Amino acid sequence: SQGVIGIFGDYAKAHDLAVGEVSKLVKKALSNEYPQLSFRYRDSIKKTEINEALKKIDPDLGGTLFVSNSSIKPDGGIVEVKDDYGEWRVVLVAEAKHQGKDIINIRNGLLVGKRGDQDLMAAGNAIERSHKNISEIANFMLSESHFPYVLFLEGSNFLTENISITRPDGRVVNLEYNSGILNRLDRLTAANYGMPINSNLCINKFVNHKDKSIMLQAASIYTQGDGREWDSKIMFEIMFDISTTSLRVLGRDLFEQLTSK
Amino acid sequence: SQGVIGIFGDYAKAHDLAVGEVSKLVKKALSNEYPQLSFRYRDSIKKTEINEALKKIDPDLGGTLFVSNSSIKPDGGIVEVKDDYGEWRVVLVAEAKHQGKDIINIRNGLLVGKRGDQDLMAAGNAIERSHKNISEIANFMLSESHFPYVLFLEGSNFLTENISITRPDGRVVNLEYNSGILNRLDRLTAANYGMPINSNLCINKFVNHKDKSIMLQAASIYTQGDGREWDSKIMFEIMFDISTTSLRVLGRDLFEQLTSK
DNA sequence: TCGCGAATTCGCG
DNA sequence: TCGCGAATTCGCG
């Protein structure tokens, strides 16, 4: 906690702040540590923007739109920095998804399944939707050398450890973390090419195969491994980390703004 | 229709063959036009395979698995070719998704909405799930210079033209193709970087921004623009086209197998 | 067995 | 208004 970061995180903790509201708290923290640079927070990017960024890499890209005022709303919002050339650069994007009511059911006594008999519920695939926004922002940032997209997972479908929950009638039901009846965590790992979860993957890797070279944009996938609620303090700390990492990678475009002024 | 391709497509038409069954019909067609090369059809790729292909590009990739026997099943299956080095190369992957019951409701008389009153139903986002399999196969093929992934869309949520449907009580309800109450087509266009839909995008583009260079893997997104059922003949023709295009891009690795033998 | 997949209705600004 | 988003239950081999 470099100075105020400890003061800020406890404010998050004190209020149980959701993901969008923490991303705002980050904007304030950042502008309280970089008072020369200019930060803003959005709750939306409209497809036209993305398309126009796509077009500027190659003129054959970004030539589709079917709904004119179409947009994407990451429920954590976007935080940006104005660089030396008046352009706005994305420093943080974040999302928070929930899947798996199982721990609630078996924390109580409600049997599930078609015939009201099962302790566990066969996990679904809705979480795969999270791959779209990742592609949009990855396309939006196809000229950047960083990818400050952070996902925050919660629920019985993203366990990293074996947890046992006791129902009102004394019985300890047990969730096995690697059971393909509950765990959907593998449905997400395409997003960071099988690199580590709960990790800051913000700086883009450059790999190859032949006369090739290719940049990979990898989402930072964070999960609460015991099905518990996320602690808004650590959620803040993580987002602060990704965004400061983003500012590192942006350094060359930010020199004049924070050194000359 | 180069010879038998006309005979094959009419067989598809005659039987109203679904997507997986057409992909099989393609395997036969291909092996009937390239009798020296060896083709196979799968209905599954397990995560371990993907991970091992990922690892072979860069040793830091592909190091995650939480459910051991986890897999992806494209409902159109995968078609592959054995190259000169005994390795199996993917020549076709295909998926078929349906969203938007609207044309059925207003082809009949069933009013929808919470209070049984609406002619149209606010479209949902389930179709965004289709972005996961795309990432898996794109990662699987991160060493290839082609991406034979084809999506086939159907329903009132993927209209390209304005269509009017008449309900039993004489009334003509009208679907506007660019209404963001029905059209979800924009939720997919992240998958081919805003390049044209209903197009064969199989050969990978290579773009850049600075001292960079990057390969783009773009899904071929085909839609039935009038909410009608797909004609299994044209569905076959399209898949034949993508896969022959794939064989073009594979040419260098296939020479010995079809020329020496 | 275990594990992948369907796509849906409605709420919210 | 229009348009984006929640994630769920159960079926199938």
Sorted by where each begins, the domain ranges of chain B are: 1-261
Are A232 and A22 spatial neighbours (Cβ–Cβ below 8 Å)?
yes
User: Resolution reached, in Å?
Assistant: 2.5
Sign for the pseudo-dihedral over CA of B187, B189, B194, B199: negative
- Please give the backbone phi and psi of residue A229, each rounded to the nearest 5 degrees, phi first: -65, 145
Q: Whole-angstrom Cα distance, residue A162 to residue A179? A: 10
Are A69 and A38 spatial neighbours (Cβ–Cβ below 8 Å)?
no
Q: Whole-angstrom Cα distance, residue A140 to residue A88? A: 12
Q: What residue spans of chain B are helical by DSSP H?
A: 4-15, 19-33, 47-55, 102-107, 130-140, 232-250, 255-259
The pair of structure tokens assigned to A146 is: 């960083």
**Stretch (H or E) spanning A255:** helix A255-259
Query: Which residues have CB under 8 Å from B31's CB, separation 6+?
Result: B37, B38, B39
Pairing of strands A149-154, A220-223: parallel
Considering only CA atoms, which of B258, B246, B156 is closest in space to residue B200?
B246
Are A174 and A227 spatial neighbours (Cβ–Cβ below 8 Å)?
no
- Between residue 16 and residue 45 of chain A, the positions with Cβ below 7 Å from nucleic chain D are none
Are A195 and B63 spatial neighbours (Cβ–Cβ below 8 Å)?
yes
Could you give the C-alpha distances from A33 to A2, A27, A246, B61, B185, in angstroms and in order?
Answer: 9, 10, 14, 34, 42
- Please give the backbone phi and psi of residue B138, each rounded to the nearest 5 degrees, phi first: -65, -40
Asked if strand D contacts A261 at the CB level, meaning under 7 A, the answer is no
Other Cβ atoms within 10 Å of A209 Cβ, number: 15
Other Cβ atoms within 10 Å of B244 Cβ, number: 21
Query: Which residues have CB under 8 Å from A149's CB, separation 6+?
Result: A93, A94, A95, A134, A137, A138, A217, A219, A220
Tokens 């996320």 locate to A230
Beta-bridge partners for A149 = A93
| Domain B1-261 fold | ECO RI Endonuclease; Chain A (3.40.580)
The pair of structure tokens assigned to A157 is: 């479908």
Cα A249 from chain centroid (whole Å): 18
Q: Is B81 exposed, middle or buried (0-12, 13-18, 19+ CB in 10 A)?
A: buried
Inter-chain contact B190–A54, Cβ cutoff 8 Å? Answer: no
Other Cβ atoms within 10 Å of B34 Cβ, number: 16
Considering only CA atoms, which of A188, A57, A84 is closest in space to residue B64?
A188
To test the contact with chain A by mutation, choose from B183, B186, B222 the residue with the greatest count of A C-beta atoms within 10 A, namely: B186
Q: Whole-angstrom Cα distance, residue A82 to residue B12? A: 56
Strand C nucleotides within a 7 Å radius of protein CB atoms: 2-12
The pair of structure tokens assigned to B42 is: 């799968």
Tokens 């006791």 locate to A166
Residues of A in contact with B57 (CB under 8 A): 207-209
Sign for the pseudo-dihedral over CA of B176, B161, B26, B134: negative
Inter-chain contact A135–B209, Cβ cutoff 8 Å? Answer: no
Inter-chain contact A54–B128, Cβ cutoff 8 Å? Answer: no
Catalytic residues of A: 75, 95, 97
Considering only CA atoms, which of A98, A108, A220, A210 is closest in space to residue A168?
A108
Query: Which residues have CB under 8 Å from B73's CB, separation 6+?
Result: B43, B44
Asked if strand C contacts B97 at the CB level, meaning under 7 A, the answer is yes
